[PDB]
Design a protein around this ligand. Structure first.
Ligand SMILES: Cc1noc(C)c1-c1ccccc1
Ligand SMILES: Cc1noc(C)c1-c1ccccc1
Lengths: 108, 108
């Protein structure tokens, strides 16, 4: 759709290149990061790499569905991490940009 | 008074305000009442639907994005402060899904 094209080419491209985006471009690697409780707490892992691949494989049926995945990614970060962790501030910044760009999305 | 702000008031806020899970969000978190002495130490910008509704009623917002950021802050505060297993997190997620669904059809 026009909306999914906007989410891919306008919203995602703007988040992806951001200086705080690198932790969110691929799944959380709990082994590498040494977080053995990560998958016990976060039951629906999500990241922008997964979202981008879904957008490109025509996985989504509606823009809302893609937006839900972005939300899961941010929510997972807030739920798992300590409120004072830098990663929370990084998610908040990206999330604010996501909403700004979503506000200008085409209507269909 | 913009087309988008009207949508936020008449479609988004209308849908969320009356929801069966909305009650904890209709007024600011009362840390004294709930016995949460650390709430304001962790959450620096409290937000709730009553405040947002008032702002929409009183033409406080200059742009739809500003209102959208208030909704987002309300939900994000809830995910950051509470434990992963708290019911309030599920309630917030249910409301936020509706928020995103409706926002996907907001006028461009
Ligand atoms: C992203 C993200 N969400 O939770 C954690 C933990 C991360 C993360 C932190 C550092 C590097 C990569 C991912
Ligand atoms: C909403 C909300 N966010 O954190 C807390 C704590 C609440 C809350 C829980 C029960 C009743 C009212 C607010």
């Amino acid at each position: 759709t026009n909306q999914l094209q906007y989410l891919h080419k306008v919203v995602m491209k703007a988040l992806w290149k951001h200086q705080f985006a690198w932790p969110f471009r691929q799944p959380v690697d709990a082994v590498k990061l040494g977080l053995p409780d990560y998958h016990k707490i976060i039951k629906q892992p999500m990241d922008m790499g997964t979202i981008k691949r879904r957008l490109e494989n025509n996985y989504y049926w509606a823009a809302s569905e893609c937006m839900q995945d972005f939300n899961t990614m941010f929510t997972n970060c807030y739920i798992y991490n300590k409120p004072t962790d830098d990663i929370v501030l990084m998610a908040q910044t990206l999330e604010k940009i996501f909403l700004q760009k979503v506000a200008s999305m085409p209507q269909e």
